[PDB]
Amino acid sequence: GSWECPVCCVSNKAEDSRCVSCTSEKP
Amino acid sequence: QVQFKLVLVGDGGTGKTTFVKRHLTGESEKKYVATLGVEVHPLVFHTNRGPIKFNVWDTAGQEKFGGLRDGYYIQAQCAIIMFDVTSRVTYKNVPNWHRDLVRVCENIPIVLCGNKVDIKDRKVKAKSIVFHRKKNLQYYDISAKSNYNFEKPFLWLARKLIGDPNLEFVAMPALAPPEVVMDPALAAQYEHDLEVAQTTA
Ligand SMILES: Nc1nc2c(ncn2[C@@H]2O[C@H](COP(=O)(O)OP(=O)(O)O)[C@@H](O)[C@H]2O)c(=O)[nH]1
Ligand SMILES: [Mg+2]
Ligand SMILES: [Zn+2]
Protein backbone atom coordinates (compact mmCIF):
# COMPACT_ATOMS: atom_id res chain seq x y z
CA GLY A 1 0.00 0.00 0.00
CA SER A 2 3.05 2.24 0.36
CA TRP A 3 3.46 5.02 -2.19
CA GLU A 4 6.45 7.11 -3.25
CA CYS A 5 5.93 10.87 -3.08
CA PRO A 6 6.03 12.40 -6.57
CA VAL A 7 7.36 15.65 -5.09
CA CYS A 8 10.21 14.66 -2.74
CA CYS A 9 10.56 10.87 -3.24
CA VAL A 10 9.95 9.87 0.40
CA SER A 11 8.21 6.51 0.89
CA ASN A 12 4.89 6.85 2.73
CA LYS A 13 2.29 4.48 4.19
CA ALA A 14 -1.18 3.91 2.75
CA GLU A 15 -2.70 5.34 5.94
CA ASP A 16 -1.16 8.70 5.01
CA SER A 17 -3.33 10.84 2.73
CA ARG A 18 -0.33 13.11 2.22
CA CYS A 19 3.49 13.08 2.60
CA VAL A 20 4.83 13.04 6.19
CA SER A 21 7.82 15.06 4.97
CA CYS A 22 6.59 17.63 2.45
CA THR A 23 2.81 17.31 2.99
CA SER A 24 2.23 16.68 -0.73
CA GLU A 25 -0.92 14.73 -1.67
CA LYS A 26 -0.92 11.00 -2.37
CA PRO A 27 -1.56 10.35 -6.10
CA GLN B 1 15.17 0.11 -6.85
CA VAL B 2 17.55 0.90 -3.98
CA GLN B 3 17.36 4.50 -2.79
CA PHE B 4 17.90 6.40 0.47
CA LYS B 5 16.93 9.89 1.62
CA LEU B 6 20.17 11.60 2.58
CA VAL B 7 19.95 14.85 4.51
CA LEU B 8 22.95 17.16 4.06
CA VAL B 9 23.43 19.62 6.93
CA GLY B 10 25.96 22.02 8.42
CA ASP B 11 26.47 25.78 8.85
CA GLY B 12 25.69 28.11 5.96
CA GLY B 13 28.70 28.73 3.74
CA THR B 14 30.34 25.36 4.41
CA GLY B 15 29.86 24.28 0.79
CA LYS B 16 26.92 21.87 0.97
CA THR B 17 25.48 23.17 -2.30
CA THR B 18 28.80 23.18 -4.16
CA PHE B 19 29.39 19.65 -2.91
CA VAL B 20 26.11 18.04 -3.94
CA LYS B 21 26.20 19.85 -7.31
CA ARG B 22 29.40 18.05 -8.29
CA HIS B 23 27.23 15.10 -9.36
CA LEU B 24 26.06 16.11 -12.82
CA THR B 25 23.01 13.89 -13.22
CA GLY B 26 21.98 14.73 -9.68
CA GLU B 27 22.04 18.36 -10.73
CA SER B 28 20.05 17.90 -13.97
CA GLU B 29 17.41 15.64 -12.37
CA LYS B 30 17.03 17.52 -9.05
CA LYS B 31 13.51 18.15 -7.77
CA TYR B 32 12.37 21.32 -6.00
CA VAL B 33 10.29 20.82 -2.88
CA ALA B 34 8.53 24.17 -2.53
CA THR B 35 6.82 23.60 0.82
CA LEU B 36 10.22 23.11 2.45
CA GLY B 37 12.39 25.17 0.11
CA VAL B 38 14.49 22.10 -0.66
CA GLU B 39 16.21 20.76 -3.77
CA VAL B 40 16.47 16.95 -3.84
CA HIS B 41 19.40 15.63 -5.92
CA PRO B 42 19.15 11.96 -6.99
CA LEU B 43 22.76 10.75 -6.93
CA VAL B 44 23.17 7.35 -8.54
CA PHE B 45 26.33 5.32 -7.83
CA HIS B 46 27.05 1.98 -9.58
CA THR B 47 28.27 -0.68 -7.19
CA ASN B 48 29.15 -4.33 -7.62
CA ARG B 49 25.76 -5.01 -5.97
CA GLY B 50 23.90 -2.88 -8.56
CA PRO B 51 22.82 0.81 -8.60
CA ILE B 52 22.22 2.76 -5.37
CA LYS B 53 20.50 6.12 -5.36
CA PHE B 54 21.05 8.78 -2.69
CA ASN B 55 18.32 11.39 -2.76
CA VAL B 56 20.32 14.19 -1.15
CA TRP B 57 18.29 16.98 0.44
CA ASP B 58 19.99 20.36 -0.02
CA THR B 59 18.70 23.51 1.69
CA ALA B 60 18.13 26.86 0.03
CA GLY B 61 20.09 28.68 2.77
CA GLN B 62 17.51 28.74 5.59
CA GLU B 63 20.12 27.13 7.88
CA LYS B 64 21.69 30.59 8.16
CA PHE B 65 18.75 31.78 10.28
CA GLY B 66 18.04 28.88 12.61
CA GLY B 67 17.35 25.14 12.78
CA LEU B 68 15.53 23.29 10.01
CA ARG B 69 11.87 22.22 10.26
CA ASP B 70 11.05 18.62 11.24
CA GLY B 71 9.77 17.87 7.72
CA TYR B 72 13.28 18.35 6.39
CA TYR B 73 14.63 15.58 8.65
CA ILE B 74 11.59 13.29 8.48
CA GLN B 75 12.25 9.80 7.06
CA ALA B 76 15.93 10.55 6.44
CA GLN B 77 17.83 7.28 6.25
CA CYS B 78 21.36 8.68 6.39
CA ALA B 79 23.22 11.98 6.59
CA ILE B 80 26.34 14.02 6.01
CA ILE B 81 27.33 16.81 8.38
CA MET B 82 29.65 19.36 6.85
CA PHE B 83 31.84 22.09 8.29
CA ASP B 84 34.48 24.39 6.81
CA VAL B 85 38.09 23.53 7.75
CA THR B 86 38.90 27.22 7.32
CA SER B 87 36.27 28.23 9.91
CA ARG B 88 36.59 26.99 13.49
CA VAL B 89 33.04 28.12 14.28
CA THR B 90 31.48 25.76 11.68
CA TYR B 91 33.26 22.88 13.40
CA LYS B 92 32.04 24.17 16.78
CA ASN B 93 28.43 24.07 15.56
CA VAL B 94 28.69 20.42 14.48
CA PRO B 95 27.35 19.08 17.83
CA ASN B 96 24.20 21.18 17.41
CA TRP B 97 23.53 19.70 13.96
CA HIS B 98 24.05 16.19 15.27
CA ARG B 99 21.61 16.92 18.12
CA ASP B 100 18.85 18.29 15.85
CA LEU B 101 19.36 15.46 13.34
CA VAL B 102 19.29 12.71 15.95
CA ARG B 103 16.29 14.20 17.78
CA VAL B 104 14.29 13.40 14.63
CA CYS B 105 16.18 10.57 12.97
CA GLU B 106 18.09 8.75 15.75
CA ASN B 107 20.76 6.13 14.97
CA ILE B 108 20.98 6.57 11.22
CA PRO B 109 24.45 6.28 9.64
CA ILE B 110 26.22 9.68 9.55
CA VAL B 111 29.40 10.94 7.88
CA LEU B 112 31.25 14.01 9.11
CA CYS B 113 33.03 15.99 6.38
CA GLY B 114 35.50 18.85 6.69
CA ASN B 115 35.24 20.72 3.40
CA LYS B 116 37.59 23.11 1.56
CA VAL B 117 40.87 21.26 2.25
CA ASP B 118 42.18 22.61 -1.07
CA ILE B 119 42.97 25.79 0.87
CA LYS B 120 46.54 26.16 2.10
CA ASP B 121 45.66 28.15 5.24
CA ARG B 122 43.78 25.44 7.12
CA LYS B 123 42.26 26.27 10.51
CA VAL B 124 40.63 23.05 11.72
CA LYS B 125 43.25 20.29 11.50
CA ALA B 126 43.05 16.51 11.91
CA LYS B 127 44.22 16.54 15.54
CA SER B 128 41.35 18.88 16.43
CA ILE B 129 38.73 16.81 14.64
CA VAL B 130 37.28 14.64 17.39
CA PHE B 131 33.48 14.77 17.28
CA HIS B 132 33.07 11.70 15.04
CA ARG B 133 35.17 9.47 17.30
CA LYS B 134 32.72 10.16 20.13
CA LYS B 135 29.42 9.45 18.41
CA ASN B 136 30.20 6.46 16.12
CA LEU B 137 30.66 8.66 13.04
CA GLN B 138 33.13 8.26 10.16
CA TYR B 139 35.29 11.23 9.09
CA TYR B 140 36.63 12.41 5.69
CA ASP B 141 38.50 15.50 4.59
CA ILE B 142 36.86 16.67 1.36
CA SER B 143 37.16 19.43 -1.21
CA ALA B 144 33.98 20.03 -3.18
CA LYS B 145 35.68 22.35 -5.69
CA SER B 146 38.36 19.81 -6.64
CA ASN B 147 36.16 16.71 -6.33
CA TYR B 148 38.64 15.49 -3.66
CA ASN B 149 37.29 12.45 -1.77
CA PHE B 150 33.87 13.16 -3.29
CA GLU B 151 32.84 9.52 -3.35
CA LYS B 152 34.08 8.51 0.14
CA PRO B 153 31.11 9.66 2.21
CA PHE B 154 28.69 7.87 -0.14
CA LEU B 155 30.72 4.67 -0.19
CA TRP B 156 30.90 4.45 3.62
CA LEU B 157 27.13 5.02 3.85
CA ALA B 158 26.32 2.40 1.18
CA ARG B 159 28.40 -0.16 3.02
CA LYS B 160 26.62 0.67 6.31
CA LEU B 161 23.08 0.70 4.92
CA ILE B 162 23.34 -2.46 2.81
CA GLY B 163 25.43 -4.23 5.45
CA ASP B 164 28.21 -5.27 3.09
CA PRO B 165 31.76 -4.24 4.07
CA ASN B 166 32.98 -5.39 0.63
CA LEU B 167 30.70 -3.12 -1.41
CA GLU B 168 32.61 -1.25 -4.12
CA PHE B 169 31.80 1.44 -6.67
CA VAL B 170 32.40 0.00 -10.16
CA ALA B 171 33.06 3.51 -11.52
CA MET B 172 32.99 7.16 -10.40
CA PRO B 173 29.84 9.08 -11.41
CA ALA B 174 30.26 11.85 -14.01
CA LEU B 175 31.37 14.93 -12.06
CA ALA B 176 31.85 18.62 -12.84
CA PRO B 177 35.55 19.11 -13.69
CA PRO B 178 37.73 20.34 -10.78
CA GLU B 179 37.58 24.14 -10.49
CA VAL B 180 40.66 24.28 -8.28
CA VAL B 181 43.71 22.03 -8.04
CA MET B 182 43.95 19.74 -5.01
CA ASP B 183 47.70 19.49 -4.37
CA PRO B 184 48.69 15.78 -4.36
CA ALA B 185 51.47 16.61 -1.89
CA LEU B 186 48.85 18.19 0.39
CA ALA B 187 46.39 15.30 0.05
CA ALA B 188 49.22 12.95 1.03
CA GLN B 189 50.00 14.93 4.18
CA TYR B 190 46.38 15.50 5.24
CA GLU B 191 45.79 11.74 4.96
CA HIS B 192 48.79 11.00 7.16
CA ASP B 193 47.69 13.46 9.83
CA LEU B 194 44.21 11.91 9.91
CA GLU B 195 45.49 8.34 10.26
CA VAL B 196 47.80 9.31 13.11
CA ALA B 197 45.09 11.33 14.87
CA GLN B 198 42.72 8.34 14.64
CA THR B 199 45.29 6.32 16.58
CA THR B 200 45.73 9.09 19.19
CA ALA B 201 42.70 8.85 21.50
N1 LIG C 1 38.03 26.77 -1.79
C2 LIG C 1 36.85 26.11 -1.74
N3 LIG C 1 35.70 26.83 -1.65
C4 LIG C 1 34.49 26.22 -1.59
C5 LIG C 1 34.44 24.75 -1.64
N6 LIG C 1 33.14 24.41 -1.58
C7 LIG C 1 32.41 25.55 -1.49
N8 LIG C 1 33.22 26.64 -1.50
C9 LIG C 1 32.78 28.05 -1.43
O10 LIG C 1 31.99 28.32 -0.27
C11 LIG C 1 31.03 29.34 -0.55
C12 LIG C 1 29.65 28.85 -0.15
O13 LIG C 1 29.41 27.58 -0.75
P14 LIG C 1 27.93 26.94 -0.67
O15 LIG C 1 27.87 25.69 -1.53
O16 LIG C 1 26.82 27.90 -0.99
O17 LIG C 1 27.85 26.58 0.90
P18 LIG C 1 26.45 26.13 1.54
O19 LIG C 1 25.63 27.31 2.02
O20 LIG C 1 26.80 25.19 2.67
O21 LIG C 1 25.61 25.41 0.53
C22 LIG C 1 31.07 29.59 -2.04
O23 LIG C 1 31.74 30.84 -2.27
C24 LIG C 1 31.87 28.43 -2.60
O25 LIG C 1 32.62 28.79 -3.76
C26 LIG C 1 35.74 24.03 -1.74
O27 LIG C 1 35.80 22.79 -1.79
N28 LIG C 1 36.86 24.76 -1.79
MG1 LIG D 1 23.39 25.95 0.16
ZN1 LIG E 1 7.09 14.37 -0.20
Which residues in chain A are contacts of B33 at CB distance < 8 A?
7-8, 22
Out of 3.40.50.970, 3.40.50.300, 3.40.50.1000, 1.25.40.10, the CATH code matching B1-201 is: 3.40.50.300
Nearest to B33 among A8, A11, A20 (CB): A8
* Residue pairs between chains A and B whose CB atoms are closer than 8 Å: 34
In this structure, are residues B53 and B46 in contact, taking their beta carbons and an 8 Å threshold?
no
The structural domains of chain B, with segments of one domain joined by +, span 1-201
Q: How many residues does chain B have?
A: 201
Ligand with the closest atom to the CA of B19: 1
Residues sharing a CB contact under 8 Å with residue B15, sequence separation 6 or more, in sequence order: B82, B84, B115, B116, B144, B145
* CA B46 – CA B120 distance, rounded (Å): 33
> Cβ < 6 Å from ligand 1: which residues?
B 12-18, 115-116, 118-119, 143-145, 180
In this structure, are residues B9 and B63 in contact, taking their beta carbons and an 8 Å threshold?
yes
